[PDB]
Structures are given as structure tokens and as C-alpha cells.
């Protein structure tokens, strides 16, 4: 077939990054390691900072929208009761 266009990823042996020189890596077989050494030292301290260094970007927008919905629901409940009957004709104009 015809050759393709120019991309930003290749294949094994010609992947297309920069040239590497001076880096050594080491690894050990999984058959020679301890079986399942995580629930502790990861539920102790690791799985608390991973979201509570991030919790303030979620809960400030969540508290704004929950305050807005709860305030509007109590005002609709007041308007259709007996005590809020006089305001109801005023705001449906």
C-alpha cells in the first residue's frame, strides 16, 4: 500500500522520542516478592493525603450549589402553604 502521513508515535524500536544515554534501570521478579504488602502503609497515610490535598477544589463548589438548591426548595415550600398565600399572587404577576 501507499505510505501514511506523519504522526507523533511510532512502534517498538522506533517509538519517536529523544535519544537516551546514561540511565540504568533495575527490577526484581514478582515470584520473589512478598505477597500483598499494601493494605497497610497505604490506608494508614497514603489514601488520605491523595484526596485531602485535593478536597478543597471539590467541596467549595459542592457547598455553593447545595446551599443554592436547599434555599430555593424552602422558598417554594413557603409559597404554597397558608402563610405564603399573599406573596404568591404578587410574584406570579
Amino acid at each position: 500500500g501507499p505510505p501514511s502521513g506523519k504522526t507523533y508515535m511510532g512502534w517498538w524500536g522506533h517509538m519517536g522520542g529523544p535519544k537516551q544515554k546514561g540511565i540504568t534501570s533495575y527490577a526484581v521478579s514478582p515470584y520473589a516478592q512478598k505477597p500483598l504488602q499494601g493494605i497497610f502503609h497505604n490506608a494508614v497515610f497514603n489514601s488520605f493525603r491523595r484526596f485531602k490535598s485535593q478536597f478543597l477544589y471539590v467541596l467549595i463548589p459542592a457547598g455553593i450549589y447545595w446551599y443554592w438548591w436547599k434555599n430555593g426548595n424552602e422558598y417554594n415550600e413557603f409559597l404554597y402553604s397558608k402563610a405564603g398565600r399573599e406573596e404568591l399572587e404578587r410574584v406570579n404577576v
Binding site: 537516551q20 544515554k21 540504568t24
Partner: protein, 431 residues
Amino acid sequence: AEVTQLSNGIVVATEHNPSAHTASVGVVFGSGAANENPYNNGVSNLWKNIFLSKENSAVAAKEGLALSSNISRDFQSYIVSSLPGSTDKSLDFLNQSFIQQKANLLSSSNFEATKKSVLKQVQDFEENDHPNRVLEHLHSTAFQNTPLSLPTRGTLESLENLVVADLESFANNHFLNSNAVVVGTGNIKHEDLVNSIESKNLSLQTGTKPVLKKKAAFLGSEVRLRDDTLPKAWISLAVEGEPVNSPNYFVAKLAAQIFGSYNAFEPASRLQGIKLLDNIQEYQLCDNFNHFSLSYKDSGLWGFSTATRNVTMIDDLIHFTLKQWNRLTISVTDTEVERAKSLLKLQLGQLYESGNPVNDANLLGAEVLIKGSKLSLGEAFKKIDAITVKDVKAWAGKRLWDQDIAIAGTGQIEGLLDYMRIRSDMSMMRW
């Protein structure tokens, strides 16, 4: 062909050959690079170049003598060679320069010049000799934190901290009478050597060497040294093998002879009776390979090394080689075993019957230090002839099928896949 061992306090071994035109006499010690620690690594390689230094070689050359020395993982030797009529001068030179006096060799002017020459050799080894330094890195990852991992030359970082007092401390612990064998090869008779030693009263030192506490142990691991400015890829891979004094010592050497060696540019190497060569030559998957079976006092390594310019098809080369290793458990044929028997006998006969008495002195001394005697070539041929197909299948089911591996590599090794893809090829999910 006969060896003769005799002890009178000193173990003396000979191998007489009245057809040779030279003689060779030396001493072999039973300590190597596996008796060092990570802080004095390279102290054996410094003792070799002190013995081969210029002023020591000049005293020998006025007599007509030549000097050799070899450093391995389990032993080291110091050898003098001469004409057959002057073995008394060669035994005198071994007494004066190496046993009695060592303050002549260990002067400050001679030590600093020798240490400069050794540091340049190790630096040129680490930059240019790519097949042999990958095999050195295979030993250090397979036996990590264990005495069998230290390189025989030492490292550049450990060699510069060495002083004269480090070499004298190693010599007082290992250069002993209970660690030594006096050898003689070529044209020299046995009773002429033991009467020349007994006409003096040679003795190095009384006592035994230190005992190390950690024994060798194989660990499945890998080390990658990627260098994209080199033109090839160099890879070694092995499992845990057999030590010396193993009952499966000759069966492991025959299994490596089945797959053998290869050179893509030699025309007769392309016509060998190896079934792996059908897959490799179809797309030219490599330039050369060779299989090995190394043995030491406590452990060993069985595997292969290879060099490749086809860097996008590296994963096909490892996959085809490991699928042929599976056949040693399942479906190895009787005609492959008979071919490997004849080629192992030709290879062993060329190693032990070369015409070099220096090669014979290294082989004889290393075997008497471990076993206490030497196995003849006639008795080694009869053990090879008795191996059956069922012996090969029982050995490979223990050492090869579903076992851990060790990998080392340098150069353009981006196409080499990670550990678990290669580890899963050590079994077929067919049987």
C-alpha cells in the same frame, strides 16, 4: 597421559609430556574475586599487574623466562615458563620474587605506576567491550548482595581507594600453604620437581583462610543500560545452572551443545543441524549467538548471549529461542542428542589437548584445588556416551520449565519487552 598428585606438606601436581618443547611451573591459589568485599574489589587484579611489572619481567628475561597470570572467580595463578633444561632457574625465580621478598615489588614508585596502568584498562573495558561487559552485568544482577556478583577486574570507584596496606592485608589472609597447589606441565618429570622443592624447605605461611558467611543464591532480576548512540543491541539471558561436583554437570553441557553457536557471515555456520536456524534466517533476526553452561564452586548459569542490528524485531528473536528451550522437556529427538554427543567430545578434546602448557597449568591447578584429583579425558568420554533422551528430559523439567530468569542488555534495546512477557515464555500452555 597421566597426572600425579603428591603431598609432603605442599600439594604438588604434574602432567608430563615428553613430546613438548617447553616447560611451565607455577603456583595456583584457591581464592578469587568471590573472596573479596565491595571495598577492596580489584585487589586481585592489582596483584597480577604487580607480578607482571617491568622490573620483575626484566629480571626474568635475562634468565630466559616468561611470566603469565590469570584472575578468575574461584582461583588465581602465577606461572613461569622456560626451556626444558632450565626448570631449576624458574623455580628459583618463584621463590625469591614472590615468596621471600615483596618489599621490592611494593615500593611506592612501582605501586603508583602500576595503579595508573590498571585504571586505564578498566576504563577502556567499560567503554568499548560491549559483549563481555554485558556478561559481567549478568553476574551482578543474578547474584546480587552475594560474593559471586563482584567483577573480576574491579570497578573504577573501588580501585582508587586502594593503598599498599590493602594488598598486604589480602596476601596475609589468602596466600597460604593450605590454599595453594604447585603445578608443572609440559616436558618435566614428577620426581624431578618434588626433589627440587625438597632440596629446599619452602613454606608460605601456616594457617587457614577466612570463611565467608553468605552463600551464593540466584535471584530473578534484570538490569538495562540503554545507549541509543551505539549501532547494535547486546543481550544476555540465563537461568540458574549447575556447580562443580554436580551429578548433572555433563548433562547441562550437552544441552547447551544442542543449540550451539552461530555466525551469519560464515557460510558453513549457516548449514548446521540446529532447528532454531530456520526461524532466524527467514528475516535475519541476529548477527551471532552462543550458548553456555558456566559452573562455579557454589552455583552456575545456563543460557545464551546475542548481538543484533535488527532492532525492530528483538521480540521475535527472544520468543523463538525460548520456544526451542521448551522442547527439551517435551519433544527432543534422538538424532539431536547423538549430534550433540559428538560435538561435545570434539569441544572438550580441543580444550584439554591444546599445545599450550600455560593453558594446561591453569586447568590442572583449578581442578585439584576443588576435587583433590583430576578426571581423565577417557573417563569423561564414557560419561557423555551414557546419556539418554530421558536424562535430558528429566534435567530440563527441573531447571528450565517454569523457572525464573535473569536478563542484561545494552545499546538500542527499546524493542526488548518487559520482564513478565519474557518470563511467561518459559512454559507452554499446551503441556
